[PDB]
């Protein structure tokens, strides 16, 4: 399900060089190499917040009719792989008196630090919008060198 | 596996509860709350790498005697969780001519995409030290509070 990302980053790229045409899941799917069935679900949630038309029927199909330059990718991240509230299946101890401190606390101290980690992760993400990631496809090291810059 | 980064953490503190003792692997996983089989490994590794000692047999068990002050929060993290070098299951198009320019150089780009913003959650955890967790352990908020005064 993390794939989910590329899955939407490959479909908007796919869909802004085919500005001119309606492009249906069959289609997409080709591009992607998958099967509708695991791509349908990120169309329609695209969709749904606006990224992309999706007209319904014969000839029908999702069109992308927006720019790149306005999507920002953290959104796009944060859409397509949600914020994680609860981290119990990686916390170790007891689940929710006798406990001891270690067994009492730990939970609550590894979701604070892993919930501040995440926010620094997704951080990164909202930097940047599609139309840098287009520019790192069509020039590769570009996300290279923004780190170099930043060091 | 990314329970892991917690049984080394619970397990170096419940070690530095009991810094007179010996304690086996049986006695630990009852604090864990884990089978002794799933935290085995890890126990091992961090014997291996220096943080614990480790004797064998009557008695014997693990034993912390180093300080957690000199335990980089990040270090562990990345022995216990290493840097993932392929992202391939979580990106689309083909794998290593006729490739279209988005399928050719989608995956170089998000695999310098994810691997930047791995660098930079990794980096949260290098700012810490096992004595910073203890210290949020005891007086909760400790890690929330460093991110107010960093933001």
């Known amino acids: 399900m993390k794939l989910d990302f590329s899955v939407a980053v490959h479909s908007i790229l796919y869909l802004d060089a085919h500005r001119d045409s309606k492009v249906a899941s069959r289609e997409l799917a080709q591009s ?30 999702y069109q992308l009719d927006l720019a790149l330059a306005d999507m920002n990718l953290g959104d796009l991240y944060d859409l397509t792989i949600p914020p994680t509230i609860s981290y119990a299946r990686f916390i170790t101890g007891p689940s929710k008196a006798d406990q001891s401190p270690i067994a009492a606390n ?20 909202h930097q940047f919008t599609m139309a840098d990631l287009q520019a790192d496809l069509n020039h590769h090291g570009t996300f290279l060198q923004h780190e170099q810059d930043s060091e």
Chains 1, 2 share one sequence.
Do not use: C, W
């Open 32 to 61: 992607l190499h998958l099967n509708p069935v695991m791509i349908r679900n990120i169309l329609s949630v695209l969709h749904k917040h606006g990224y992309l038309t999706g007209t319904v029927g014969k000839n029908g199909g």
């Open 106 to 125: 730990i939970s609550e101290t590894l979701t604070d630090l892993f919930t501040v980690a995440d926010r620094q992760y997704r951080a990164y993400y």
